[PDB]
Write a protein that binds this ligand. Sequence first.
Ligand SMILES: *[C@H](O)[C@H](C[C@@H]1CCNC1=O)NC(=O)[C@H](Cc1ccccc1)NC(=O)[C@@H](NC(=O)OCc1ccccc1)[C@@H](C)OC(C)(C)C
Ligand SMILES: *[C@H](O)[C@H](C[C@@H]1CCNC1=O)NC(=O)[C@H](Cc1ccccc1)NC(=O)[C@@H](NC(=O)OCc1ccccc1)[C@@H](C)OC(C)(C)C
Lengths: 306, 306
Amino acid sequence: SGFRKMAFPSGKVEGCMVQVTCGTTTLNGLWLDDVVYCPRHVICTSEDMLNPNYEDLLIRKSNHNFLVQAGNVQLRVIGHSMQNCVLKLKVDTANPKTPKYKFVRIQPGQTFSVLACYNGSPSGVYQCAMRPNFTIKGSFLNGSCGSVGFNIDYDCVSFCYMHHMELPTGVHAGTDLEGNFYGPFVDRQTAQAAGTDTTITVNVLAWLYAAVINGDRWFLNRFTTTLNDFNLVAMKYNYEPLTQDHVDILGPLSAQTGIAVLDMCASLKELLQNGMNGRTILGSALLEDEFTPFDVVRQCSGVTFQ
Amino acid sequence: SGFRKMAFPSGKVEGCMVQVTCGTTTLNGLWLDDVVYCPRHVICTSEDMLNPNYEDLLIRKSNHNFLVQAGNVQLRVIGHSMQNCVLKLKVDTANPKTPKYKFVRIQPGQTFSVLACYNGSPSGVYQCAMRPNFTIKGSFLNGSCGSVGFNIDYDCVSFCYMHHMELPTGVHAGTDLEGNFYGPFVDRQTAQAAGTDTTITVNVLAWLYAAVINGDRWFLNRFTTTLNDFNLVAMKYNYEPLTQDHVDILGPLSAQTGIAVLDMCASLKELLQNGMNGRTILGSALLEDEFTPFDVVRQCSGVTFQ
Ligand SMILES: *[C@H](O)[C@H](C[C@@H]1CCNC1=O)NC(=O)[C@H](Cc1ccccc1)NC(=O)[C@@H](NC(=O)OCc1ccccc1)[C@@H](C)OC(C)(C)C
Ligand SMILES: *[C@H](O)[C@H](C[C@@H]1CCNC1=O)NC(=O)[C@H](Cc1ccccc1)NC(=O)[C@@H](NC(=O)OCc1ccccc1)[C@@H](C)OC(C)(C)C
């Protein structure tokens, strides 16, 4: 037993991280088959970033201006192209460590593991969630751009995130691996509004089922509620509206535990209206929303990969 | 910026995980050079575990009774031996994926990454701390025994923990890689007292420096205190006594931030006497103690490995 914020094993992704240098800028790239993917702002100077014309800036660059280093190994760049906000550098060597992979665009409220990297070398791994406002709350220093987020299905790595920027707040923004930003953000250094975030209600309920499964329980009340009634409480507290689809998704956890979803919402309702009284749940004094229902099923099922 | 509970990249350890089967019992082993390490209770039946005589039970076993499977690959066992609470199975093939490694016995309050595994296959990775009472608070289901904890120094993996058991509480106990339990625990299924845990004061202070570095600050007060005065407050609140050694260890963080350690203790004192008023620090409503001072320096330094 026990319940932890758990990241996927990162070995399959470590084998794909490379270093990309263009002039003065060095960041991380993702090497799959004979293509290296990286943020297109690798071609910007410190001045270019306030208002870059990426097409015009890219035209000044040739294949030999992109230095791609894999460990100490040295890739020859033989073509380059921009796709949305990512550059694709064609190299003359296919990555022998390429895992079975896919590119996916995840939905807000979903989770994924981040392999934070500097100079092409992995530094650490952590889990998080795509916020309803399409930011993530990560740990990214200077040089971390091009670090990727991902999920693993047994053998197959689904890449879903590439890091591009930090906002004047400490939250982070980036793209899918086709280069389309999550959310309204653009890759220039100008003020950018994330907008109101909300709490992922279906994830909080899944965590409450995780808590019940691990013996923590004081919160299980006595009450029940309705979907429309609970949703009134959700809006007062900036929670995402709970749908029937969310109820169906929680159907494995409701049946393993024997607790109806709307009963659990009545518990959550009282949590939101009364606080925690200085108690804790699964070792937290806050309501946790970065575990999906599938994260919980996985966690207490022992699903492995590789 | 940002600050996250971050695990080491696990690729070097993934390459060492194997499956060990003895009769009915299957668990994980750690394959380094031509030796596989695993918990010795792999030789126990469900009945043996209430009161095992490990020497007598081991005598009934021969090399061919240990089935070691590496992925699908098949290792020949050519010797076996007990060292404290671990078995060492000599195999006829050295692991080609063996990293530079060391076996270390960590101190309470230190941290390490756990690669949780089932049937020899990695499932997830998370960070934690050796509690002052020599337990860990992990996520371990049936079959997870033999999963290992570790730290990485650039190239070198320092293995420090192997999982053996859960206690009737949801906390976890295990050994170093020489088979000596952390804490007073034994490998039999009988009631076992963990004893009072305490909070790792030097780790909480490091986290408060992490918070200050990341803009979170409302807690920085006005007061100062003395080492003896603060230590009076530590005991009332089950905190480990702060030593001068702890003060010296916090010397990088005090100088980066410009805040004297005893000033930070005065802040922590007021936190302990007044609560959080429903505020949060680095996204937590509790005082976090599973980051070491070096975890913080690393985290906001961008140190990489491999
Ligand atoms: C790449 O390695 C690096 C990682 C970030 C640095 C620290 N944490 C990170 O995640 N990213 C950057 O430096 C990018 C570079 C860039 C982006 C777009 C075009 C050209 C170059 N920039 C940022 O992360 C800035 N974020 C940003 O521009 O947000 C919009 C903005 C900027 C300025 C004022 C208002 C709004 C970061 C470094 O700047 C802030 C947001 C102040 C942290
Ligand atoms: C190995 O894969 C497995 C992992 C644990 C199962 C669930 N979470 C885990 O971490 N471990 C075990 O099953 C070991 C097996 C064993 C241990 C010693 C000798 C022989 C076999 N046992 C345990 O984890 C038990 N813990 C335990 O015995 O603690 C002492 C005790 C036992 C009974 C009553 C009082 C005290 C677990 C499974 O049992 C409890 C503690 C009730 C959770």
